[PDB]
PDB file of C-alpha atoms in Angstrom:
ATOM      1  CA  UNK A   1      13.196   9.950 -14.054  1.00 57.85           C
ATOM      2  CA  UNK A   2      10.013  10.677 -12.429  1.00 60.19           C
ATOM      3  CA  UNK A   3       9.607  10.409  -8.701  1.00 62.64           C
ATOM      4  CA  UNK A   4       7.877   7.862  -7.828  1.00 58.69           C
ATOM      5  CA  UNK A   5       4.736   9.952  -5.592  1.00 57.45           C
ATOM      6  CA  UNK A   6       4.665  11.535  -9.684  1.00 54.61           C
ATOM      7  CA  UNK A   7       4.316   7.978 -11.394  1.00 53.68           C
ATOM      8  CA  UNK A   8       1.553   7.639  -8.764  1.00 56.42           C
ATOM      9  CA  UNK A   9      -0.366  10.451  -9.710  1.00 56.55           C
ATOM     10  CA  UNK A  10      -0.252  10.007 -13.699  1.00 56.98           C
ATOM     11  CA  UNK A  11      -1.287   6.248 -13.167  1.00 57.31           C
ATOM     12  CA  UNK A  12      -4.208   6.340 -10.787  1.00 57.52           C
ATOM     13  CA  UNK A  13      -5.311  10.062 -10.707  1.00 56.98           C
ATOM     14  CA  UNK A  14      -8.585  11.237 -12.564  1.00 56.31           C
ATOM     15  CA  UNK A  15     -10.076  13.606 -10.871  1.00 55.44           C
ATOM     16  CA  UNK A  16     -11.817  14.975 -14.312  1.00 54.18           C
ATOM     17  CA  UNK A  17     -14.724  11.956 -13.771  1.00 54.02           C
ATOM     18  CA  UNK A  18     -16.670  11.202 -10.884  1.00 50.17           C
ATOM     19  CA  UNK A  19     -16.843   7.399 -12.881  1.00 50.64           C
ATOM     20  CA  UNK A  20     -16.235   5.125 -15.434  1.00 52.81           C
ATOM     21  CA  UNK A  21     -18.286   6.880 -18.428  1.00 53.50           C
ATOM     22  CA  UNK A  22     -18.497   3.702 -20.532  1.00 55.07           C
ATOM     23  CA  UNK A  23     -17.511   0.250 -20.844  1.00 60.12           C
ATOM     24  CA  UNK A  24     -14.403   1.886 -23.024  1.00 61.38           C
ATOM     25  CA  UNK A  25     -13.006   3.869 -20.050  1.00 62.34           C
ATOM     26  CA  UNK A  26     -10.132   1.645 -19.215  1.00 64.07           C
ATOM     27  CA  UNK A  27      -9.029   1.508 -23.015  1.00 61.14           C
ATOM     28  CA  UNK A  28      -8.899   5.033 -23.266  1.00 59.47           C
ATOM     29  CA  UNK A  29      -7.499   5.353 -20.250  1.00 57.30           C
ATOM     30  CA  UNK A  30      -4.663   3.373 -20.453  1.00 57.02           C
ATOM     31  CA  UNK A  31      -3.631   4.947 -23.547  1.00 54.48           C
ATOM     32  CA  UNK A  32      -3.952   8.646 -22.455  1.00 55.89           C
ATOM     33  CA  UNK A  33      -1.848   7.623 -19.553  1.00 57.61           C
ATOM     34  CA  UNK A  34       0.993   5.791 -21.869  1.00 60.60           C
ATOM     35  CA  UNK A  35       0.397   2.638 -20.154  1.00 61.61           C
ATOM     36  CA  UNK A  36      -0.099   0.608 -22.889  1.00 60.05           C
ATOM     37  CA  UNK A  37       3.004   2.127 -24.893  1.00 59.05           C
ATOM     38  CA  UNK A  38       5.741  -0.768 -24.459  1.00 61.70           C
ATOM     39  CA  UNK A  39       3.627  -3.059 -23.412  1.00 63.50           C
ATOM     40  CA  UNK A  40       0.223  -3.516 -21.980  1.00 63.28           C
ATOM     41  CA  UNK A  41       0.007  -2.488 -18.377  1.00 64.85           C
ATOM     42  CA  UNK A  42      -2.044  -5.733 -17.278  1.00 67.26           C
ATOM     43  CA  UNK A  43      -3.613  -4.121 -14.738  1.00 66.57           C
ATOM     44  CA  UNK A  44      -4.716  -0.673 -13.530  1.00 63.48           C
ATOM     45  CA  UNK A  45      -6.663   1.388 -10.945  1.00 63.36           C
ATOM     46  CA  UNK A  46      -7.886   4.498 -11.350  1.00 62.85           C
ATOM     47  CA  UNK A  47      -9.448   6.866  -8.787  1.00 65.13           C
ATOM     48  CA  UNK A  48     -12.313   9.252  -9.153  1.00 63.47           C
ATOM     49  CA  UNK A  49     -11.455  11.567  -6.707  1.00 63.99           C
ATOM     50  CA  UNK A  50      -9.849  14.792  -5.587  1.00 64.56           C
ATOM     51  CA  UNK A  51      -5.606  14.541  -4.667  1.00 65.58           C
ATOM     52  CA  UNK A  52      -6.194  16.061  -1.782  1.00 64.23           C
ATOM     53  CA  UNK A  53      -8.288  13.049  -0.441  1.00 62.56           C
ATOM     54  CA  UNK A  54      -5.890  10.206  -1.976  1.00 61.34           C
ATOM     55  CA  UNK A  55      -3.269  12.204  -0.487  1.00 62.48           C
ATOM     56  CA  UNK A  56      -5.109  11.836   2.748  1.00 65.80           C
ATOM     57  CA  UNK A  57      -5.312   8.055   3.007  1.00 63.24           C
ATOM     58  CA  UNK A  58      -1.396   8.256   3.989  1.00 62.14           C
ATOM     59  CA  UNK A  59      -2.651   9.626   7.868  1.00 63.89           C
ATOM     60  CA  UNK A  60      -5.828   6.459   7.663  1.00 63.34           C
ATOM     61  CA  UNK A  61      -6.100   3.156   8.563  1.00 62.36           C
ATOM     62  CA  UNK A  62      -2.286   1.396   9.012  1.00 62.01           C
ATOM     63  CA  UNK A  63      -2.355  -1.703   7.178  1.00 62.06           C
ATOM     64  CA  UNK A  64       0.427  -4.507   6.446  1.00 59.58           C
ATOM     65  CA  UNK A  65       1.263  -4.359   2.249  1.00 56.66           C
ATOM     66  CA  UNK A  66       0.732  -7.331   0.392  1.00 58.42           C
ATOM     67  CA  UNK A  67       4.553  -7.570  -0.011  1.00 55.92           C
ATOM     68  CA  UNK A  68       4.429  -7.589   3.951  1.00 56.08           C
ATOM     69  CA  UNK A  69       5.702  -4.231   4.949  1.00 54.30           C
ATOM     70  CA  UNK A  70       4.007  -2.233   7.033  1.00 50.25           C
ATOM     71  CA  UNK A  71       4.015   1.398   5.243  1.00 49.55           C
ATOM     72  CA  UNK A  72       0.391   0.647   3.454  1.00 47.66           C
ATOM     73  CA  UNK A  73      -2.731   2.674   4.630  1.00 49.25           C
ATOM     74  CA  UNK A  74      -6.594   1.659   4.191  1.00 47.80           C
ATOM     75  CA  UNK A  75      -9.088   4.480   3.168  1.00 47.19           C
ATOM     76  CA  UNK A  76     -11.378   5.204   5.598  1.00 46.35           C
ATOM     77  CA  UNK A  77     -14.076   5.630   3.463  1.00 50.68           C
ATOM     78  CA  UNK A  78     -15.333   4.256   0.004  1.00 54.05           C
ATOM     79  CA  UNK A  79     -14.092   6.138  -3.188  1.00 54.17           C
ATOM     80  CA  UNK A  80     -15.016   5.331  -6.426  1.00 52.63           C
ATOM     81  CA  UNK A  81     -12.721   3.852  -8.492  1.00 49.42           C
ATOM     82  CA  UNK A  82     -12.166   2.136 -11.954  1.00 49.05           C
ATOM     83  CA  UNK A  83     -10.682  -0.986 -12.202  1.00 51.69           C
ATOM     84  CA  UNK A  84      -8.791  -1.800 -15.392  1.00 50.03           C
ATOM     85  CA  UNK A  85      -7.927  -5.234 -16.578  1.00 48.46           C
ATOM     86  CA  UNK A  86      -6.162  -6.754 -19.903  1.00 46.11           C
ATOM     87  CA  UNK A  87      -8.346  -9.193 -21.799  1.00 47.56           C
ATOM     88  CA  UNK A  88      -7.735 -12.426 -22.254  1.00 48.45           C
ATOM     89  CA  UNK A  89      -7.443 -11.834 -25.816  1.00 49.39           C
ATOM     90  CA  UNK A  90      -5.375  -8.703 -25.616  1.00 48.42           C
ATOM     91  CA  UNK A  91      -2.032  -8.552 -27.144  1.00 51.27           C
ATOM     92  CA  UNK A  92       0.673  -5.828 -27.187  1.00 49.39           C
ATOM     93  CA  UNK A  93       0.363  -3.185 -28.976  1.00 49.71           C
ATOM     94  CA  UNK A  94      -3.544  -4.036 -29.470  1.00 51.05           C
ATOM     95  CA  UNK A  95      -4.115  -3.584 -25.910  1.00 50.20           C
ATOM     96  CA  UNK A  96      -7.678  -4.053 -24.755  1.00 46.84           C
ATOM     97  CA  UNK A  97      -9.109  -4.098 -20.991  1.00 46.17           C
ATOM     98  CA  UNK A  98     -12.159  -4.809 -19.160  1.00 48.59           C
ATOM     99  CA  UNK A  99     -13.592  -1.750 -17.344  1.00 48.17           C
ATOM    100  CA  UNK A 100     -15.461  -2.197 -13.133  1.00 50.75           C
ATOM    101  CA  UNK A 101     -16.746   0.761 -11.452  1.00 48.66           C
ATOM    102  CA  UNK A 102     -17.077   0.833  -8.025  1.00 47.32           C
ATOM    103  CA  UNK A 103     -17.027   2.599  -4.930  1.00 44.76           C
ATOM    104  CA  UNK A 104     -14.758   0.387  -2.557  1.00 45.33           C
ATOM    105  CA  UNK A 105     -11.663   1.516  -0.070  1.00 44.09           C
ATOM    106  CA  UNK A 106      -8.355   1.776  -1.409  1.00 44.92           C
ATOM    107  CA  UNK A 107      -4.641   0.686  -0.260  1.00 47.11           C
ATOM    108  CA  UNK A 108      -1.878   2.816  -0.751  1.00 45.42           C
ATOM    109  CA  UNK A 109       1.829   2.464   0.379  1.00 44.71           C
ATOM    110  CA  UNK A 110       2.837   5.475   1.578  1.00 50.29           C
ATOM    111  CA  UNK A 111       6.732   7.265   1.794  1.00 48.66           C
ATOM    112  CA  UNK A 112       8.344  10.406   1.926  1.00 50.13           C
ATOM    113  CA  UNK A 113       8.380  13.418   3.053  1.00 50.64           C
ATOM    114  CA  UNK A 114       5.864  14.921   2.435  1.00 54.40           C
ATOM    115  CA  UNK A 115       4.307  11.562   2.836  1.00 54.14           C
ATOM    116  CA  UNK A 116       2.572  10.783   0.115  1.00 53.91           C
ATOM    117  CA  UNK A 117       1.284   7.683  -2.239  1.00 53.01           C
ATOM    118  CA  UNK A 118       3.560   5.755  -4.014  1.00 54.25           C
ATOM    119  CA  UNK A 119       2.177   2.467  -4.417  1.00 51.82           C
ATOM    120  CA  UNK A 120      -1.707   1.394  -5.117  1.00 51.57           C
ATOM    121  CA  UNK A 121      -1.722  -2.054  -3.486  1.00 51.20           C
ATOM    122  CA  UNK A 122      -5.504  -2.764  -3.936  1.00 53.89           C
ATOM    123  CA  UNK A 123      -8.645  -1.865  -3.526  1.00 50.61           C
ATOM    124  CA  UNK A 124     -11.041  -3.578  -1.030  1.00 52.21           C
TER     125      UNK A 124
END
């Protein structure tokens, strides 16, 4: 029941942190954000940086999705992100993930009006 430019925001915005505080980021991440609450999102970005500028990327660099459309835009810029993956060993509801923090681009689709992000495609 919530929008999809919403679901965007709750799973990839965190604006509190400029980074990844500790190794345990992800976990507590995930959990905060009800991710890991049916089952254990697998994987996760998260972005460390103001809405405004995420919100931004949707005027960037036009880019073709992964899926092949063509709504996806490329940051211009780095940002730094957090990059959450399930372990290997992980399983539902003891979810468990491997946190990376790094300052790469991003890869949004984009849709609506206002345009916005919907979609976080991947990180480059």
């Amino acid at each position: 029941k919530e929008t999809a430019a919403a679901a965007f925001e709750a799973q990839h915005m965190d604006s509190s942190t400029s980074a990844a505080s500790s190794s345990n980021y992800c976990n507590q991440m995930m959990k905060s954000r009800n991710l890991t609450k049916d089952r254990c999102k697998p994987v996760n970005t998260f972005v460390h940086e103001s809405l405004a500028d995420v919100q931004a990327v949707c005027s960037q660099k036009n880019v073709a999705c992964a899926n092949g459309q063509t709504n996806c835009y490329q940051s211009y810029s780095t940002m730094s992100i957090t990059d959450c993956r399930e372990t290997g060993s992980s399983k539902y509801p003891n979810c468990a993930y491997k946190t990376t923090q790094a300052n790469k681009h991003i890869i949004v689709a984009c849709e609506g009006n206002p345009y916005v992000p919907v979609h976080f495609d991947a990180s480059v």
